[PDB]
Amino acid sequence: NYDPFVRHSVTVKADRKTAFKTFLEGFPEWWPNNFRTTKVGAPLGVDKKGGRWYEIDEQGEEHTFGLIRKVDEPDTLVIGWRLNGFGRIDPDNSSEFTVTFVADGQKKTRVDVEHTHFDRMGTKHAKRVRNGMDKGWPTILQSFQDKIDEEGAKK
DNA sequence: GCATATGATAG
DNA sequence: CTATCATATGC
Protein backbone atom coordinates (compact mmCIF):
# COMPACT_ATOMS: atom_id res chain seq x y z
CA ASN A 1 0.00 0.00 0.00
CA TYR A 2 0.91 3.72 0.39
CA ASP A 3 1.95 3.87 -3.23
CA PRO A 4 -1.51 3.52 -4.85
CA PHE A 5 -3.72 3.57 -1.74
CA VAL A 6 -3.34 3.03 2.00
CA ARG A 7 -4.84 -0.06 3.59
CA HIS A 8 -4.39 -1.40 7.11
CA SER A 9 -4.84 -5.03 7.95
CA VAL A 10 -4.80 -6.26 11.53
CA THR A 11 -6.69 -9.07 13.24
CA VAL A 12 -7.36 -8.62 16.95
CA LYS A 13 -8.16 -11.66 19.11
CA ALA A 14 -9.94 -9.89 21.97
CA ASP A 15 -12.64 -7.42 20.79
CA ARG A 16 -12.82 -3.86 19.41
CA LYS A 17 -12.51 -2.15 22.80
CA THR A 18 -9.24 -3.92 23.58
CA ALA A 19 -8.11 -3.08 20.05
CA PHE A 20 -8.97 0.61 20.52
CA LYS A 21 -7.52 0.59 24.05
CA THR A 22 -4.26 -0.91 22.86
CA PHE A 23 -4.06 1.21 19.71
CA LEU A 24 -4.74 4.65 21.19
CA GLU A 25 -4.17 4.34 24.93
CA GLY A 26 -1.92 1.36 25.39
CA PHE A 27 0.94 2.93 23.46
CA PRO A 28 3.31 2.53 26.50
CA GLU A 29 2.19 -1.10 27.05
CA TRP A 30 3.43 -2.52 23.75
CA TRP A 31 7.08 -3.40 23.05
CA PRO A 32 7.81 -2.63 19.29
CA ASN A 33 8.30 1.18 19.17
CA ASN A 34 7.18 2.59 22.51
CA PHE A 35 9.99 0.61 24.15
CA ARG A 36 11.33 3.83 25.71
CA THR A 37 10.63 6.49 28.36
CA THR A 38 10.05 10.26 27.77
CA LYS A 39 10.61 9.26 24.21
CA VAL A 40 8.55 7.27 21.82
CA GLY A 41 7.27 5.41 24.80
CA ALA A 42 5.84 7.37 27.69
CA PRO A 43 2.75 7.48 30.00
CA LEU A 44 0.28 8.69 27.35
CA GLY A 45 0.78 8.00 23.66
CA VAL A 46 -2.33 9.75 22.36
CA ASP A 47 -4.64 12.55 23.46
CA LYS A 48 -8.29 11.50 23.65
CA LYS A 49 -10.08 14.82 24.04
CA GLY A 50 -8.41 16.37 21.02
CA GLY A 51 -7.31 13.43 18.96
CA ARG A 52 -3.56 13.80 18.74
CA TRP A 53 -0.69 11.37 19.40
CA TYR A 54 1.84 12.53 22.03
CA GLU A 55 3.81 11.07 24.89
CA ILE A 56 5.35 12.48 28.04
CA ASP A 57 8.91 13.68 27.50
CA GLU A 58 10.95 14.76 30.53
CA GLN A 59 10.77 18.34 29.22
CA GLY A 60 7.11 18.03 28.28
CA GLU A 61 5.55 16.03 25.46
CA GLU A 62 7.66 13.78 23.28
CA HIS A 63 6.90 12.81 19.72
CA THR A 64 3.73 13.73 17.91
CA PHE A 65 2.66 10.48 16.25
CA GLY A 66 -0.54 11.53 14.51
CA LEU A 67 -3.11 14.24 13.81
CA ILE A 68 -6.43 12.54 14.48
CA ARG A 69 -9.35 13.64 12.32
CA LYS A 70 -11.89 11.35 13.95
CA VAL A 71 -11.78 9.74 17.36
CA ASP A 72 -14.86 7.55 17.10
CA GLU A 73 -14.61 5.35 20.24
CA PRO A 74 -13.85 1.57 19.90
CA ASP A 75 -14.99 1.69 16.28
CA THR A 76 -13.08 4.06 14.03
CA LEU A 77 -10.01 6.28 14.15
CA VAL A 78 -9.12 8.57 11.27
CA ILE A 79 -5.58 9.84 11.85
CA GLY A 80 -2.93 11.79 9.98
CA TRP A 81 0.83 11.41 9.57
CA ARG A 82 3.34 12.03 12.33
CA LEU A 83 6.33 10.01 13.52
CA ASN A 84 9.09 9.57 16.11
CA GLY A 85 11.82 11.92 17.30
CA PHE A 86 14.33 10.11 15.12
CA GLY A 87 15.97 10.68 11.73
CA ARG A 88 12.53 11.20 10.33
CA ILE A 89 10.71 13.21 7.70
CA ASP A 90 8.36 16.02 8.72
CA PRO A 91 4.51 15.87 8.40
CA ASP A 92 4.90 17.10 4.79
CA ASN A 93 2.70 14.17 3.87
CA SER A 94 -0.43 14.68 5.99
CA SER A 95 -1.04 10.96 5.21
CA GLU A 96 -4.54 10.51 6.50
CA PHE A 97 -6.35 7.19 6.82
CA THR A 98 -9.62 5.80 8.12
CA VAL A 99 -8.89 3.10 10.68
CA THR A 100 -11.90 0.82 10.48
CA PHE A 101 -12.25 -1.64 13.34
CA VAL A 102 -14.77 -4.34 12.46
CA ALA A 103 -16.14 -6.10 15.53
CA ASP A 104 -16.38 -9.87 15.08
CA GLY A 105 -18.28 -11.89 17.68
CA GLN A 106 -17.29 -9.14 20.14
CA LYS A 107 -14.08 -11.11 20.75
CA LYS A 108 -12.37 -10.42 17.48
CA THR A 109 -11.77 -7.29 15.49
CA ARG A 110 -10.40 -6.91 12.00
CA VAL A 111 -9.17 -3.40 11.29
CA ASP A 112 -8.92 -2.12 7.76
CA VAL A 113 -7.58 1.28 6.84
CA GLU A 114 -8.95 2.91 3.76
CA HIS A 115 -7.65 6.19 2.43
CA THR A 116 -6.50 7.57 -0.91
CA HIS A 117 -4.93 11.02 -1.35
CA PHE A 118 -1.90 11.84 0.78
CA ASP A 119 -1.04 8.18 1.27
CA ARG A 120 -0.62 7.75 -2.50
CA MET A 121 2.69 9.63 -2.06
CA GLY A 122 4.57 6.32 -2.42
CA THR A 123 7.90 6.13 -4.21
CA LYS A 124 9.50 9.51 -3.33
CA HIS A 125 7.50 10.53 -0.27
CA ALA A 126 7.44 6.98 1.03
CA LYS A 127 11.23 6.65 0.64
CA ARG A 128 11.77 9.62 2.95
CA VAL A 129 9.12 8.01 5.17
CA ARG A 130 11.34 4.90 5.17
CA ASN A 131 13.91 6.79 7.30
CA GLY A 132 12.60 5.75 10.71
CA MET A 133 8.87 5.08 10.45
CA ASP A 134 9.41 1.75 8.68
CA LYS A 135 11.17 0.45 11.78
CA GLY A 136 8.39 1.42 14.14
CA TRP A 137 4.65 1.50 13.47
CA PRO A 138 4.53 -1.47 10.98
CA THR A 139 6.51 -3.28 13.66
CA ILE A 140 4.03 -1.99 16.23
CA LEU A 141 1.14 -3.62 14.39
CA GLN A 142 2.85 -7.00 14.73
CA SER A 143 3.41 -6.76 18.48
CA PHE A 144 0.01 -5.04 18.68
CA GLN A 145 -1.76 -8.18 17.49
CA ASP A 146 0.54 -10.36 19.59
CA LYS A 147 0.21 -8.39 22.84
CA ILE A 148 -3.55 -8.44 22.25
CA ASP A 149 -3.37 -12.12 21.32
CA GLU A 150 -2.15 -12.66 24.88
CA GLU A 151 -5.00 -10.52 26.23
CA GLY A 152 -7.65 -13.09 25.40
CA ALA A 153 -6.42 -16.11 23.47
CA LYS A 154 -2.80 -16.96 24.23
CA LYS A 155 -1.88 -15.77 27.72
C1' DG B 1 25.33 18.67 -10.67
C1' DC B 2 28.23 17.94 -7.59
C1' DA B 3 29.85 17.48 -2.51
C1' DT B 4 27.59 16.85 1.60
C1' DA B 5 24.48 14.02 4.98
C1' DT B 6 21.01 11.05 6.53
C1' DG B 7 18.54 6.96 5.63
C1' DA B 8 17.27 3.10 3.02
C1' DT B 9 18.55 0.22 -0.33
C1' DA B 10 22.47 -1.99 -2.97
C1' DG B 11 26.84 -4.59 -3.68
C1' DC C 1 33.36 1.18 2.51
C1' DT C 2 31.72 2.54 -2.01
C1' DA C 3 27.70 3.31 -4.73
C1' DT C 4 22.99 4.25 -6.02
C1' DC C 5 18.40 6.00 -4.94
C1' DA C 6 15.49 9.72 -3.13
C1' DT C 7 15.25 13.94 -0.68
C1' DA C 8 17.25 18.17 1.35
C1' DT C 9 21.01 21.39 2.50
C1' DG C 10 24.91 23.99 0.49
C1' DC C 11 27.67 25.63 -3.07
Please state whether strand C lies within 7 Å of residue A87 at its CB atom: no
Q: What is the DSSP track for A30-65?
A: -SSS--SSSBSB-S-SSBTTTTEEEEEETTEEEEEE
Measure the CA angle with vertex A87, ends A82 and A92; round to 5°. 40
Buried b (16+ CB within 10 A) or exposed e, A103-128: beeeebbbbebebeebbbbeeebbee
Q: Are A96 and A81 in contact (CB under 8 A)?
A: yes
In whole angstroms, C1 C1' to A136 CA is 28
CA A5 to chain centre: 17
Strand C proximal to A70 Cβ, under 7 A: no
Question: Does the CB of A127 sit below 7 A from strand C?
Answer: yes
Domains of chain A, earliest start first: 1-155 (3.30.530.20)
Q: Please compute Rg for chain A using Cα positions.
A: 15
Interatomic CA distance for residues A1 and A81, integer angstroms: 15
Distance A127 CA to B3 C1' (A): 22
Interatomic CA–C1' length for residue A116 and nucleotide C11, angstroms: 39
Listed residue (A155, A152, A140) closest to A26, CA to CA? A140
- Residue A130 (CA) to nucleotide C2 (C1'), in angstroms, measures 22
**Does at least one atom of strand B sit less than 7 Å from the CB of A138?**
no
